[PDB]
């Protein structure tokens, strides 16, 4: 009656805010464990006696690999129901999206351009201009996989060789390395998620994070289309010891109150409406989304990381 354990992907100071919050609201302890990535490898390997209640990962993709890899069960909650998109969630509870995000472009401040497409990122006048983070992280295998679901393999193979061959430095680290390449004068353009970027420009002033932020602007592109959005998402895991209190603390980030949070402390966007976005995040301009559904996106997951190390990609 008295806990809830969350295992997640997530950064601790993109989660622990409304851990924090939903604990003070409710009374409800969150133990949390934090993983880098196999989260299915450790929830199997756990077994029966797992104390994982509630799943929570940053890519539909991964979120998919919980629910067909048997370690989920459904939920049963008007809240979550009469709340999240109906085609932001699965059938019958089978998970659920908490927020929205959208891999973006990171531009140089000073750099004329105002549009761009997917595709473009291949062009060789980007030689030797592009920062990305791995091209295996899921963020980039889901958008991979989204341009595998527009374009077919061979396409986007031929993409990712040409955006491999425009690579100013290795695909490696974080997306917020971007920002930091960019304003190193490294690269002019990179791939990642905007609401790094609205992390970054409220960082306290003086700090590398602050300098990073302020050195970019965004600019969404689309395929040739929106621009391709992924989301936070969350399961119960399938022996939750418990359950009830799993289910409140998705029903509490879900909420008014938290999915502000989600606006104004992580930058991303509501799944819930009625709530206003960070003035900077808004600063970016209307979101115009992809068509494509996110459940779809996660259907070419496996073939897309396997382009990706099939182009050498990281070398
Ligand atoms: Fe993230």
């Given amino acids: 009656s008295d806990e809830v354990?969350?295992?997640?992907?997530?950064?601790?100071?993109?989660?622990?805010?409304?851990?924090?919050?939903?604990?003070?609201?409710?009374?409800?302890?969150?133990n949390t464990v934090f993983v880098k990535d196999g989260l299915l490898e450790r929830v199997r390997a756990e077994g029966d006696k797992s104390p994982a209640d509630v799943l929570m990962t940053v890519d539909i993709g991964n979120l998919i690999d919980l629910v067909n890899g048997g370690v989920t069960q459904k939920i049963q909650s008007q809240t979550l129901d009469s709340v999240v998109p109906?085609?932001?969630?699965?059938a019958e509870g089978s998970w659920y999206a908490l927020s929205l995000r959208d891999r973006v472009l990171y531009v140089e401040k000073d750099l004329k351009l105002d549009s761009f497409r997917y595709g473009?990122?291949?062009?060789?006048?980007?030689?030797?201009?592009?920062?990305?983070?791995?091209?295996?992280?899921?963020?980039?295998?889901?958008?991979?996989?989204?341009?595998?679901?527009?374009?077919?393999?061979?396409?986007?193979?031929?993409?990712?060789?040409?955006?491999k061959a425009n690579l100013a430095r290795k695909a490696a680290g974080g997306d917020r390395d971007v920002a930091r390449d960019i304003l190193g004068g490294i690269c002019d353009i990179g791939l990642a998620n905007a609401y790094y970027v609205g992390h970054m420009k409220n960082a306290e002033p003086g700090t590398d994070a602050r300098k990073?932020?302020?050195?970019?602007?965004?600019?969404?592109?689309?395929?040739?289309?929106?621009?391709?959005?992924?989301?936070?998402?969350?399961?119960?895991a399938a022996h939750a010891p418990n359950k009830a209190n799993a289910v409140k603390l998705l029903e509490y980030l879900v909420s008014e109150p938290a999915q502000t949070l989600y606006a104004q402390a992580n930058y991303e966007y509501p799944v819930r409406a009625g709530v206003k976005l960070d003035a900077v995040v808004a600063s970016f301009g209307p979101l115009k989304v992809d068509t494509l559904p996110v459940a779809e996106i996660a259907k070419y997951r496996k073939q897309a990381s396997e382009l990706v190390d099939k182009v050498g990609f990281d070398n």
Avoid at 8 to 28: C, H, M, N, V
Avoid at 155 to 163: F, H, I, Q, Y
Wanted: positive net charge; proline residues 5%.
């Fill in 212 to 236: 990073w932020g302020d050195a970019i602007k965004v600019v969404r592109p689309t395929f040739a289309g929106g621009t391709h959005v992924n989301i936070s998402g969350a399961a119960v």
């Fill in 120 to 163: 473009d990122l291949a062009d060789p006048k980007w030689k030797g201009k592009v920062c990305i983070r791995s091209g295996q992280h899921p963020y980039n295998t889901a958008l991979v996989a989204a341009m595998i679901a527009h374009d077919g393999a061979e396409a986007t193979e031929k993409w990712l060789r040409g955006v």
């Fill in 5 to 30: 354990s969350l295992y997640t992907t997530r950064e601790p100071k993109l989660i622990q805010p409304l851990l924090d919050a939903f604990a003070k609201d409710s009374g409800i302890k969150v």
């Fill in 86 to 90: 109906a085609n932001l969630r699965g």
